[PDB]
Structures are given as structure tokens and as C-alpha cells.
């Protein structure tokens, strides 16, 4: 009791020192610095392509490395590879369990990762001597629902599960090589850094934790939400990231300085955010909401510059090509739209 | 094909074949009755699993009855926040709840502050008032009635219900329990609750399930075709 109380007081006074340093270094907010720039007037994106063929709610998608192919997953039990130029299907993969919540595309373009309520992450090999697609590896070390997964490289993967833990695996051996246990709530998303050395992870306890892949300790933490966290993605530079919560608000955090750079929210919106993605230059932030349409925010002024109102249901997945030319959005109506 | 090469034509043909296969798979899979089996604490969940049968996150059960294919989802072992994965069962046909009424005098395995029936009622109320199950039918399946009948003779149900005054027999107590469980419903118009007492024969349980799902199917078809 006494030891716990004194230790909690010590942690609180370290937090007070940290926030005092934050306030001392916060001479002017990001909005004050960036108000001098010229804001964008109005951007309009039209649906160049409309992918159809899914018969259930689409929950995840990932753009390809060449900005030409993409992957999509729904509850129908099918994983579909789409050619975004001519609207062609390259591969259709049946899933063992139809309860899937995430999918990833390998940077080399040879493997695809999937996972969901089955507590198992499945890897499928695309470039095979045979004419079909076969499962290469199965990870079953978690005891909670898998919420996100991203290929670290051709041989390593990182997954976030519902058991308040994250796991960096080793595909060739099949066993976890690093375990991250610092969350008190279900983990919903993660995003890899552009330099491929660190990664941030969001959970339901309104805290985002930054982890080191090589070492594997609680490198950084951030607490700025009042509800659960649904999406997270790094800035194109890699020194910042953006998180979306269930309180109809997104926040921008900085890796180097533990700050809250900007809060993207509006009084009209009362529903949370399912997906968050950035642009190539880091000027446009794309946020998918529960009000059946997406939104575009100018990241340096926190104002709305466009609405991609073309979906009849809640949007769940959003992605941007590596060259930043097309925006692919999916929704629960089983329709994928490429806005440009 | 005016400005499409031979390889482009072959790719288009492959895409059309994939579309045909996907449509066939969807048509094949859009004719199976999905049920969500759910219980509170230590109940007769596995009991009715064995009666109706005749990867720890979710358990899939497949069976057939009267040329009707039933897929039961048992997600008791997920052990996570229900609000983050319950929306994927929005399109489920029916929810088979599990309550044993013989645990009225038995306290919780973790504390004696409350008995299991109150937790069952509190979780039934949460399930009924869910935003994703406004028009999802619920079956009750009050089981373990024999033990309750034996226990009601030695110990009355006044302990569980201090405001209840009855004959303390079996029929009256069962009727009171059923009425209290039915009163937890808040809509009473968009959704309905079906109550049944399990017997030693699997036929009664499977027939009740078949009748309930048939009624739900008829209601859904009537709503779809605009006759109501």
C-alpha cells in the first residue's frame, strides 16, 4: 500500500516534469506556425474505377508496392487481388475462417498475410511454380483476436492481437521472436515506420505505444484519447503519426517530442473513425468515418477540403498508393472505389 | 477488344471466370442458416451442443435438419471486449441464449454477493438492448429444470426474489422465471423471444430450433417481398 502509493506519486511527478518540459518547449502550436501558409481551396476526387464482386462487408485492404495491384478481404471468405488499372481480378483465395479483420501485402509482392477471430495468422505464397495459391505459414501463438498485421520484410512479420499483446514472428521457423506486453486493453491497429526499425500500436485503453523492433521494450507512450483507438499510420517522413478514435476525433502525435500537434474533429460529425491514411507529401489526411462517407483534411490547418461521398454504408478500409496518385476506399456495402 | 491485345483478352477472360466462380460460391453460401450460441458463466451450453449435434477464439458447428443447413457460432471462449467483435454477427439469423434456472440458490464461483441467475439476467438485458440486434430473434432454452424442481422443494425461490409470493411449486416458479426473463425485452415488436424447456430427448430441442428458425425465415421473406 505505502510502497504502491509512493511509487504512483513518483510516476505522477515524472509525468508532471514531462508535461512541464512539453509546455516549456511548446512556445507555439503547429496551427500557429502553419497558419502563415496558403490553405488549399477545394479538391474534388472522382471515382475512376468501381471494383465489385464482394458479397459481404469489406474489412481490410492494402495497396501494392508498384501502385498497380491491391488486395481485399471480406466476410465472404474470399481474398481478392485487384488490378486497379483495367479492373481485373488476378487471384481469388479461399479463407479457412470467414471471420477476418486484417490483411497485408508483402513489399516484394510474393506473400499475403491474413488473420481474424481464429487467433491464427495465415501466409499465402503468390509466386508459385504451381498455378494455384497455397498457405505457407500459420501462426497460432496468440490467445486473442488478431486486429492488424504488417510484413516487416520478406521473412519477418509483426502482428497485433486482442490479448493486449503484440508479437514479432519469424516466418521461416514459425515461432515468435519478440513479444511486446505493455497494453492493458485490446490492441486494434499498428503501423510500421518508413525506416523499418520502430512501430506504433494503438489499443482500446486510449493509449498509443511506440515499440522498437530490434530491442522490444516500451520505447514511447502517448495518451490523448477518451475512447478506443481504431486506426493508426505513420507520417510519410516518419517523425509523426496520426490516430483515430471512437469519439469522432483524430490526433496527430510526434515521435521526437511527446506532443499533441493537432486534433481533427468537427461538431457535425458524431461518429468515430475506422481508417486513417496519409498522402505522399503529408499534406492531405484521409479519414474514414461511420457516417457512410470519408473526409479529407489539410494536415497543416485542420480543415476539411473534400468529402468522398460515394458509399452507401460505413467505410472500414482506406489506402493510398506509394506514388500517391489514387485513393482506394472500401465499405460494408462490398464496393471498392478508386478516387482520383 | 478494339484496342486490346491478346494477353489483355486472356486477362479479361480470366477475370470473367473468377467473377463467375465468386458468384457461384456466393449463391451456394447464401442459403445456410447462421445461429449464434451464447451463454452466461457455467450454463448448459455444451449440453445443448451435444443435443443438437447428435481456433479457440470461435467454434464452428455444422449440422443438418429437415434439409436445412445450420451453422452455429460458439464464441464463448473469445475472452475479449464484446463491443469490438459483435458487429460481425449483425446478419445472424437468431441468437440461442443459455440459462439454467437451477442456479437460483447457487452463488457465483468468485463471490457470494450475487447468484448466477442475476448475472444471467444482466447479460440477457445487455444482449437484448444491443444496437446490432434490434430485429434479431432470441431463443431462451431454460434447461436443467429437473435440478431446479428438486431444489425448490427443500429451498424456496424467495431468496432469489424477495418480492415474489407464490405457491412455491414447480409450475408456478417456472412460469414466474419465464415471465421475468420475457420482461427483460425492450422492443417487443421488432423482435420476439422464444421460450422452451429442454427434455432428455434431442428431438424436442431440434424441433423447437427448426420451428423458430422457420418462423424467422418466413418473417424475413415477408419483409423482403413487401407483403407486410
Amino acid at each position: 500500500g505505502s510502497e504502491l502509493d509512493q511509487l504512483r506519486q513518483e510516476a505522477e511527478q515524472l509525468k508532471n516534469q514531462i508535461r512541464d518540459a512539453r509546455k516549456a518547449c511548446a512556445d507555439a502550436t503547429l496551427s500557429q506556425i502553419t497558419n502563415n501558409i496558403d490553405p488549399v481551396g477545394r479538391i474534388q476526387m472522382r471515382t475512376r474505377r468501381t471494383l465489385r464482386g464482394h458479397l459481404a462487408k469489406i474489412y481490410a485492404m492494402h495497396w501494392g508496392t508498384d501502385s498497380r495491384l491491391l488486395v481485399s478481404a471480406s466476410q465472404d471468405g474470399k481474398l481478392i487481388i485487384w488490378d486497379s488499372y483495367t479492373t481485373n481480378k488476378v487471384h481469388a483465395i479461399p479463407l479457412r475462417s470467414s471471420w477476418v479483420m486484417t490483411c497485408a501485402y508483402a513489399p516484394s509482392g510474393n506473400y499475403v498475410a491474413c488473420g481474424g477471430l481464429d487467433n491464427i495468422c495465415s501466409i499465402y505464397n503468390l509466386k508459385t511454380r504451381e498455378g494455384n495459391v497455397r498457405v505457407s505459414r500459420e501462426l497460432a501463438g496468440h490467445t486473442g483476436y488478431l486486429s492488424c498485421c504488417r510484413f516487416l520484410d520478406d521473412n519477418q512479420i509483426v502482428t497485433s492481437s486482442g490479448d493486449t499483446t503484440c508479437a514479432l514472428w519469424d516466418i521461416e521457423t514459425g515461432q515468435q521472436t519478440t513479444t511486446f506486453t505493455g497494453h492493458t486493453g485490446d490492441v486494434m491497429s499498428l503501423s510500421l515506420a518508413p525506416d523499418t526499425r520502430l512501430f506504433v500500436s494503438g489499443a482500446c485503453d486510449a493509449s498509443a505505444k511506440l515499440w522498437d523492433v530490434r530491442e522490444g521494450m516500451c520505447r514511447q507512450t502517448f495518451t490523448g484519447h477518451e475512447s478506443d483507438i481504431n486506426a493508426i499510420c505513420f507520417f510519410p517522413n516518419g517523425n509523426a503519426f496520426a490516430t483515430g478514435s471512437d469519439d469522432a476525433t483524430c490526433r496527430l502525435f510526434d515521435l521526437r517530442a511527446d506532443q499533441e500537434l493537432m486534433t481533427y474533429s468537427h461538431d457535425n460529425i458524431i461518429c468515430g473513425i475506422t481508417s486513417v491514411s496519409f498522402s505522399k507529401s503529408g499534406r492531405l489526411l484521409l479519414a474514414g468515418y461511420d457516417d457512410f462517407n470519408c473526409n479529407v483534411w489539410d494536415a497543416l490547418k485542420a480543415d476539411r477540403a473534400g468529402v468522398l461521398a460515394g458509399h452507401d454504408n460505413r467505410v472500414s478500409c482506406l489506402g493510398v498508393t506509394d506514388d500517391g496518385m489514387a485513393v482506394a476506399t472500401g465499405s460494408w456495402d462490398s464496393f471498392l472505389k478508386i478516387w482520383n | 477488344g478494339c484496342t486490346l491485345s491478346a494477353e489483355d483478352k486472356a486477362a479479361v477472360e480470366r477475370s470473367k471466370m473468377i467473377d463467375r466462380n465468386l458468384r457461384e460460391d456466393g449463391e451456394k453460401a447464401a442459403r445456410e442458416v447462421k445461429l449464434l450460441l451464447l451463454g452466461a458463466g457455467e450454463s448448459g451450453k455444451s449440453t445443448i451442443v451435444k443435443q443438437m449435434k447428435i481456433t479457440t477464439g470461435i467454434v464452428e458447428t455444422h449440422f443438418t435438419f429437415k434439409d436445412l443447413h445450420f451453422k452455429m457460432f460458439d464464441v464463448g471462449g473469445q475472452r475479449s471486449e464484446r463491443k469490438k467483435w459483435i458487429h460481425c454477427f449483425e446478419g445472424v439469423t437468431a441468437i440461442i441464449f443459455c440459462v439454467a434456472l437451477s442456479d437460483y440458490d447457487l452463488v457465483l464461483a468468485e463471490d457470494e454477493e450475487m447468484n448466477r441467475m442475476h448475472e444471467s439476467m444482466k447479460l440477457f438485458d445487455s444482449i437484448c438492448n444491443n444496437k446490432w440486434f434490434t430485429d434479431t430473434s432470441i431463443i431462451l432454452f431454460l434447461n436443467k429444470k429437473d435440478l431446479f424442481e428438486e431444489k425448490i422443494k427443500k429451498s424456496p425461490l424467495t431468496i432469489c426474489y424477495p418480492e415474489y409470493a407464490g405457491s412455491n411449486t414447480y409450475e408456478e416458479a417456472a412460469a414466474y422465471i419465464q415471465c421475468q426473463f420475457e420482461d427483460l425485452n425492450k422492443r417487443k415488436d421488432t423482435k420476439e423471444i422464444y421460450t422452451h424447456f429442454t427434455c432428455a430427448t434431442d428431438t424436442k430441442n431440434v424441433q423447437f430450433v427448426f420451428d423458430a428458425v422457420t418462423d424467422v425465415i418466413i418473417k424475413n421473406n415477408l419483409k423482403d417481398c413487401g407483403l407486410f
Partner: single-chain antibody
Amino acid sequence: VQLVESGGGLVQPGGSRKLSCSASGFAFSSFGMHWVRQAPEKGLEWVAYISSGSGTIYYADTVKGRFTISRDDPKNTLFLQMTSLRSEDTAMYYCVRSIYYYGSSPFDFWGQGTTLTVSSSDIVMTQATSSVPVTPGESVSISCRSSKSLLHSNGNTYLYWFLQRPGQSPQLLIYRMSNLASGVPDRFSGSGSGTAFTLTISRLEAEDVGVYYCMQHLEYPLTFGAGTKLEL
């Protein structure tokens, strides 16, 4: 993965013959098939093509309406029925698998084929040279010509470079004029420009001797060119 052929033998001018090909080790139901001819002591020529699902069937112009092709997915067997065989129908026959999607590489596996002896507009491919003596350890170049631009509006060139070692089945080296095949050394390379195509070898080994062919796939019928022979 393998394909084996059967049906070859001695045939009189008046008669019919069915050539069978059986494939094992891959998904035959999703691979388009090509029947390709190769006259002895002369270049190889196209015969027929069948697409996946038996949707598209193409025949050679000189043998149009004269041969028939059929596919069997449950048994993974390809049949080529021939009704008439003249004095010019003596050659070897090969079956080639090819699957078409984005990033795919058609003409990967060639089988072994079988011989057949008889008891007796289109873009043209040509190569000026036919026999270039060379010693190992030096770069070599083989040139092919075309009568029209092979660059389609999509943005790729339908040019292929193969290899036929003496006594061995042909294999794939370069597909789409700029992409290397699978399982081949990096020494081989291809460079196309307008109507001039060059296959270049940086370091030459004793296994690189044989007859090279230049291949086009812009449109049907698929007219082929004469190979160039490199000898040790």
C-alpha cells in the same frame, strides 16, 4: 511440374492422327496451352492455341479449319486431332503452358514434344545471321528484325527470347523484351528498340551453345523467325 507427349510415329499422307499431352505437377485447369511446330533443320512455327476454360481457340492460318484442339480439365489432358497430313507436315510438336495476368510470364514450360514424319498483314521475324562462331569468355549479341512496331498502346513490347540446346527441349530466357525468366542465369539480357532486337550474353559458358529464336505475340497468326546457331 511436367508435361509428356504421345502419338508420334509414321503416318501416310491420307489419314488422321491424335496427339495427346498429359500434364502433372501443376494446375492444368488455369493454364492456356499452345501447340508449336518445329521443322527439322529449320525454325519452329506455331500451330494452335487454346485458352483457359475452352473459351478462345486459335488455329494456324495455313492449317485453319484443318486441325482441331480440345482440353480436358478433370483428366488434365490436351488433344490435337489432325485430319489431313501433307508432305510439309513432318516436324516435332511441343506443348507450352502460359497463364495471362498482370506480372505473369507466358511460355514457361515446353514439355518434350514428339516427332512426326510423313511418308512423302502478319509481322515477319527475320535474323540476318545464322551461325556465329565464338569462344567462351566474351560477350556475344544476336539480332532479330521486325516488320512493324511491337510496342502496344498499353506500354509493353511482346518480344520473347528462347534457347534450344542440341538434343534438348526449348526453354524461356527473356519475356516481354526486358524481363528475365525463372531459373536462368543473369548473364543473358535483352534490349529492344523499334524493329531491332538484341539478345546479349556477357560471359559465355559451354552450356550456352545452341539455336536462339526471337518470338512475337502482338497478334495472331503468330509468324516466327529463323534462329541463330552458336557453336563451341
